Amino acid sequence: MVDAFLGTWKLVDSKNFDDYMKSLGVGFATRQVASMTKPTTIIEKNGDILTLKTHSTFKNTEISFKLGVEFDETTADDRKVKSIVTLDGGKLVHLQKWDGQETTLVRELIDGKLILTLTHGTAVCTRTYEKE
Ligand SMILES: COc1ccc2c(c1)c(CC(=O)O)c(C)n2C(=O)c1ccc(Cl)cc1
């Protein structure tokens, strides 16, 4: 169920996040800081409204959305995008669109870990979170 995503998660592993951030035009100083951060992700629901918070020493974010209903988003890196989050093959798929560009933030559960795959063009980052 979507319910298995709910709770508090902490970053334990990251692969190619710098490449993903470069692909979005994030500056080197921000990449440095964001590269050494181990955020906490909190996923909550109220009926069919899901809230996803990420907290770190660098930045806090929060979005709320209904699955399958588009929303306007200002991203952590300050892009203004058109977004939708759906459930697809048991994965939470967040698609962001802006200026004819796209990025996906895909979350899936494997062996009790939450795996976040970030794709922007060629750049693919994988980040693993464990349950708190
Ligand atoms: C579209 O995708 C993004 C954007 C920003 C992100 C992340 C993923 C993740 C990935 C995650 O949630 O693990 C973290 C940690 N971000 C930051 O905090 C962040 C904030 C501001 C800037 Cl400028 C750059 C990075």
From Swiss-Prot:
UniProt binding sites for octadecanoate: R127, T128, Y129
Cellular localisation: Cytoplasm
Annotated keywords: Acetylation, Cytoplasm, Lipid-binding, Phosphoprotein, Transport
Modification Phosphotyrosine, positions: Y20
Keyword Acyltransferase applies: no
Tagged with keyword Metal-binding: no
GO biological process, one term: response to insulin
UniProt-listed Pfam families: Lipocalin
Principal location listed in the UniProt entry: cytoplasm
Positions bound to hexadecanoate: R127, T128, Y129
Signal peptide (residue range): none
Phosphoserine sites (modified residues): S23, S83
Positions of post-translational N-acetylvaline modification: V2
Molecular function GO labels: cytoskeletal protein binding; icosatetraenoic acid binding; long-chain fatty acid binding; long-chain fatty acid transmembrane transporter activity; oleic acid binding
Annotated Gene Ontology cellular component terms: cytosol; extracellular exosome; extracellular space; nucleus; sarcoplasm
PTM-bearing positions, type Phosphothreonine: T8, T30
Highest taxon listed in the record's lineage: Eukaryota
Binding site for (9Z)-octadecenoate: R127, T128, Y129
Domain notes: Forms a beta-barrel structure that accommodates the hydrophobic ligand in its interior.
Family: Belongs to the calycin superfamily. Fatty-acid binding protein (FABP) family.
Functional description taken from the UniProt entry: FABPs are thought to play a role in the intracellular transport of long-chain fatty acids and their acyl-CoA esters.
Name assigned to this protein: Fatty acid-binding protein, heart
Organism: Homo sapiens
Protein encoded by which gene: FABP3
